[PDB]
Design a protein around this ligand. Sequence first.
Ligand SMILES: Nc1ncnc2c1ncn2[C@@H]1O[C@H](COP(=O)(O)OP(=O)(O)O)[C@@H](O)[C@H]1O
Ligand SMILES: [Mg+2]
Ligand SMILES: [Mg+2]
Length: 359
Amino acid sequence: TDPLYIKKICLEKVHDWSRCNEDDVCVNQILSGLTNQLFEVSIKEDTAIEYRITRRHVLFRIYGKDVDALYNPLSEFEVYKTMSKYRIAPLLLNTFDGGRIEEWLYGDPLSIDDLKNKSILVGIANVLGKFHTLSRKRHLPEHWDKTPCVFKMMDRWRLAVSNYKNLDKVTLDINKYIQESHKFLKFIKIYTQIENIANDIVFCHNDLQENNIMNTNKCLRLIDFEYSGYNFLSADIANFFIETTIDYSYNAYPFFIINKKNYISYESRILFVTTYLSKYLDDSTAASDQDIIDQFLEAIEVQALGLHLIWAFWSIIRGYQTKSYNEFDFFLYAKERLKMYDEQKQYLMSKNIIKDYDD
Ligand SMILES: Nc1ncnc2c1ncn2[C@@H]1O[C@H](COP(=O)(O)OP(=O)(O)O)[C@@H](O)[C@H]1O
Ligand SMILES: [Mg+2]
Ligand SMILES: [Mg+2]
């Protein structure tokens, strides 16, 4: 929170910033969540060229809490260090007591409007396909839990919502969707055993939204790996497909807009899956069979069903963590995700896809 202390740390822990002093450093907090105290720390451009500083900016990350950030543990840093070493995440620069300093990526995150740009969608599928090949093209730490994160996130966040006194939701029954959570996990265990490319277990980002894809214009880069891990690759794409209908940049209550009509078109979904497999299969990309594509798209819609329950639980816990100092309406967002679960589940049953789901 102290700005002068941030300057004193960066002057000490960023190389050749020792030439500068506190009155050459600018500290600017950037919007994020509350598990983050992210700052844009820079050296004033006038001083930066006469001293000839080449690294003008850095990302200053202050770890928030430890069990009030009840989402990841300390495994976040070990995963981030791996992603940093393989030049996938922003380069780790240094660490300090309470947080770390990361390479500053110039540019802006993608907007909700950029997701309508077909060349942007193709560029995202290219990056995602190349990214999902990491587990098989390089050596990941052998002790990592290979349990798909769709199970871990569903379990560890459904248990947190379980212990909450009288939710008094809109349409009351939070335990209805707690029971629905068990039905999805029991179903998805059987479903993902069908030999489908979309059921491949790879290292996934697990939070693919537009505000986590940087448009450096040099390329498209991923950030915010706090939830990344092993998962069905179709869960990463389903998250991105869902996020084309959610606009977080609205600046009045409830600070987001759901436009379900803006869902990525069927043609764009085919183009995305076509471009994705062109880089994920890498070699014999000829598996752009239409039967294979209609199948990728099906498993994507199945994973989307559980994602709504996963992120509704996440929002409920985020609502109680923010309990009485609020702006974003996490509880309304949780309802919108639960409503998306009812609509997606009814759409899946209308096509007879989630058989033996027990409703
Ligand atoms: N290395 C970086 N360089 C530039 N901007 C960053 C960097 N890391 C994060 N940001 C900015 O911070 C915002 C949120 O950070 P993020 O890591 O996504 O935290 P969270 O999503 O948990 O709040 C992003 O919208 C992005 O603009
Ligand atoms: Mg983010
Ligand atoms: Mg995050």
